[PDB]
């Protein structure tokens, strides 16, 4: 298909999978918005290989090999996701380094793994979420990447910790645990408690500890918003606040994360306030 229809393919992907990020980045100007769609499609395919694919090691390495060919300028394909990403790399000075780092992060979910410390958690969050922020920065803040980089990495930490805090039960059912073992020990929340899906006072202490780290990272990220160009401030600030609002959503539902999303109306409220 042509470039317009390849980008529209990516528009469908982001709209189907993230009401938050599709709504936030729809507010960007045309070519920046389309580039975000193409970058999102790259991230979605990598994560879905590892989290939903039936042969994730072989499929992720094949994806990595395709990205190598893409970066050499030699990938000949009819895949709309690569057609769109080719244009985005041509149109904006996208840096391949965080794209490779995403793949490093996805490799971390191929085999059994225990998060021991908060440092272990941030290492994982850096490679699977902070890298997304870094992929986007040349589109969102041309010429100002080094100025906003730290806030973008920390926004990744904030969003990934939020994701983890929302998904404790979903991940448990999928035989994954991202809560640090050392905080489980600190607060006296055992593996048997977690397996029993217990929402007790120790769980809440641990959950709030992580949530407060996320809130600190969101605050640090939002402090950098004046350094973005004006046309990126509502998209980035809106994405940040809409995703942060998952935390208070869970609190308002009494920390029940073993069975949470921000309502459509609340997303509109946050976007209006940014605007």
Helix axes 56-71, 80-91, angle to 10 degrees: 40
Q: Which is nearer to Mg ion, 45 or 233 (CB)?
A: 45
73 binds a copy of itself (CB under 8 A): no
Report whether 167 belongs to an annotated binding site: yes
Closest CA relative to residue 250, chosen from 166, 135, 178, 143: 166
User: Which ranges constitute the DSSP H helices of the chain?
Assistant: 3-17, 19-25, 30-52, 56-71, 80-91, 96-107, 118-125, 131-140, 145-166, 168-173, 181-187, 191-195, 201-223, 230-252, 264-274
Let me know: does 42 contact 17? Beta carbons within 8 Å: no
Which of 196, 212, 253, 263 contacts a copy of itself by CB under 8 A?
196
CA distance 127 to 160: 10
113 binds a copy of itself (CB under 8 A): yes
103 binds Mg ion (CB under 5 A): no
Q: State in angstroms the smallest separation of the CB of 196 from a copy of itself.
A: 7
Q: Which is nearer to ligand FPS, 74 or 192 (CB)?
A: 192
226 binds a copy of itself (CB under 8 A): no
Q: State in angstroms the smallest separation of the CB of 113 from a copy of itself.
A: 6
Closest CA relative to residue 94, chosen from 156, 44, 136, 55: 136
CA distance 105 to 217: 20
Residue whose tokens read 């609002």: 245
Alpha carbons within 13 angstroms on the beta-carbon side of residue 110 total 15
Q: Interface with a copy of itself by CB under 8 A: which range of 122-130, 191-199, 210-218, 254-262?
A: 191-199
Q: Which is nearer to ligand FPS, 13 or 76 (CB)?
A: 13
Report whether 68 belongs to an annotated binding site: no
Q: State in angstroms the smallest separation of the CB of 236 from ligand FPS.
A: 5
Which of 29, 142, 188, 229 contacts a copy of itself by CB under 8 A?
188
Report whether 109 belongs to an annotated binding site: yes
Binding site for ligand FPS (CB under 6 A): 18, 21, 36, 39-40, 43-44, 47, 51, 128-129, 132-133, 136, 152, 155-156, 159-160, 163, 167, 236, 239
List CB contacts of 155: < 8 A, sequence separation 6 or more: 130, 133, 217, 218, 221, 236, 240
- Chain positions contacting a copy of itself, by CB under 8 A: 53-57, 109-114, 172, 174-175, 177, 179, 181, 184-185, 188, 190-192, 194-196
| Residues in the annotated binding site for Mg(2+) | 47, 51, 109, 163, 167
């Amino acid at each position: 298909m042509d470039l317009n229809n390849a980008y529209d393919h990516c528009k469908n992907i982001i709209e189907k999978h993230s009401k938050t990020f599709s709504k936030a980045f729809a507010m960007l100007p045309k070519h920046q918005k389309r580039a975000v769609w193409a970058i999102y499609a790259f991230c979605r395919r990598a994560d879905d290989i590892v989290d939903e694919g039936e042969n994730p090691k072989e499929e992720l390495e094949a994806f990595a090999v395709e990205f190598d060919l893409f970066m050499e300028g030699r990938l000949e394909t009819e895949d709309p996701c690569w057609i769109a990403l080719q244009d985005a790399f041509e149109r904006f000075p996208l840096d391949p380094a965080p794209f490779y780092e995403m793949i490093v992060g996805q490799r971390m979910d191929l085999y059994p793994k225990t998060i021991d410390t908060k440092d272990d958690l941030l290492h994982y969050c850096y490679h699977v979420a902070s890298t997304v922020g870094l992929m986007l920065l040349p589109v969102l803040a041309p010429g100002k990447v080094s100025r906003v980089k730290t806030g973008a990495i920390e926004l990744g930490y904030a969003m990934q910790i939020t994701n983890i805090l929302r998904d404790i039960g979903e991940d448990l059912d999928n035989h994954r645990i991202y809560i640090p073992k050392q905080m489980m020990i600190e607060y006296g929340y055992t593996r048997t408690d977690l397996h029993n899906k217990k929402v007790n006072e120790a769980f809440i202490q641990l959950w709030e500890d992580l949530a407060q780290d996320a809130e600190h990272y969101y605050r640090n990220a939002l402090a950098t918003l004046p350094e973005y160009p004006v046309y990126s401030r509502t998209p980035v600030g809106g994405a940040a606040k809409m995703y942060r609002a998952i935390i208070q959503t869970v609190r308002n539902n009494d920390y029940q994360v073993f069975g949470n999303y921000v309502s459509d109306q609340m997303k509109k409220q946050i976007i209006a306030e940014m605007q």
